[model samples]
Target: ATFEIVNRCSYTVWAAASKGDAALDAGGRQLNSGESWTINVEPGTNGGKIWARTDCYFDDSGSGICKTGDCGGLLRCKRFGRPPTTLAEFSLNQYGKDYIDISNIKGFNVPMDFSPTTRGCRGVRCAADIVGQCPAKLKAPGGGCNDACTVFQTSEYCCTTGKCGPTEYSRFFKRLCPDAFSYVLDKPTTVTCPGSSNYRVTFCPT
Candidate 1:
């Protein structure tokens, strides 16, 4: 018989260290073998140390390996199922309304540029481009990681002025991985408290 297990854990998973133990269910599926089994219900207050093993694949049981980048460890477990929204969505203007047309709320003073993704800032001294939208496969002369961030290096004058040039990398962590942040939930999403007219924020808030 072949066995294939899936991780249905809610929230981000921090798996246990490799151990040669096994916990099998009454139906003959194994769980907790120095590993973890799939979670059917939301792991509401549960966190850390999960594992699973399968009899289907060879190579010391079907203990799948995990690969991660910004997504974190346990690839199959993390990405297999869709996750609940962790933050509410906001607009560029909403993100910049109070500021000087910048993506930050507390006034980092960085401004947003809506140009055709080229030529730094037209007619303006230094306008920042949209984060994570740099041209694909484009690199510097020396094949460096020249995206929107490094692109500003070629702008106006770096030698003359001591100020850092406009670049998108500055806002990458915030604009790209805003979830790492936390705030009160406030959006028009499906999540709503009974008797409330406004939608609650899902993930990170302001």
Candidate 2:
């Protein structure tokens, strides 16, 4: 599978990706404005996660803490990324098919535009300024905006029980990003495309 990650943010961001036991972008990379990188994954790449980290400082050996979306304190991520950040998820499937989605469930930091470039498949984007106007209670301490579940422990948002539903907090995210998966049980936010299709993940899209 072909994946292109582009950075159009005014500032730099560290893009990281994870797939099974493999850490991508050496776990992460410093992508300055207007820069983009591509990742090629063979078949069977499932539950693939991609995200951006901001306000990061790394030593020569790739060790540092990011204000948002930090995974292992290593420049190269070794596991799933922490929350309060935008995410792009993918799952390459059988018979040359695949899935892609933009998820705001982790919270919101960078504005992202993710889509497949073939088969007339749908693409989802979350380019709203969620960080600037985040609600006081849902705001992350380090930076960025957090989902209600992350800030509040209620079952309505956390789905601690067998089910959950959308609420005012989720509506805030949904209103800003209708194309993204704003809730844990969100529906119809996914798009399928041919397996051979190339993909684009743009940040701070304007």
**Best model per lDDT:** 2
lDDT of 2 by residue, 102-164 (tens): 888879989999988666687889998898888888888898999888888788898788598
Which residue pairs in candidate 2 collide?
26-76, 27-76, 27-77
Clashes of each: 14, 3
lDDT of 2 at 190: 84
Model 2 RMSD to the real structure?
1.5
Model 1, span 117-184: residue lDDT tens: 12212111112231124234323332112333223444321222444443334344245323222111
Model 2 TM? 0.93
The root-mean-square deviation over C-alpha atoms between each candidate and the true structure, in angstroms, is 17.8, 1.5
C-alpha TM-scores of all predictions: 0.20, 0.93
Which ranges in model 1 have alpha carbons more than 4 Å from their true place?
1-39, 42-60, 69-170, 177-206
- Once fitted onto the true fold, the runs of candidate 2 whose alpha carbons sit more than 4 angstroms away are 94-96
Highest TM-score scorer: 2
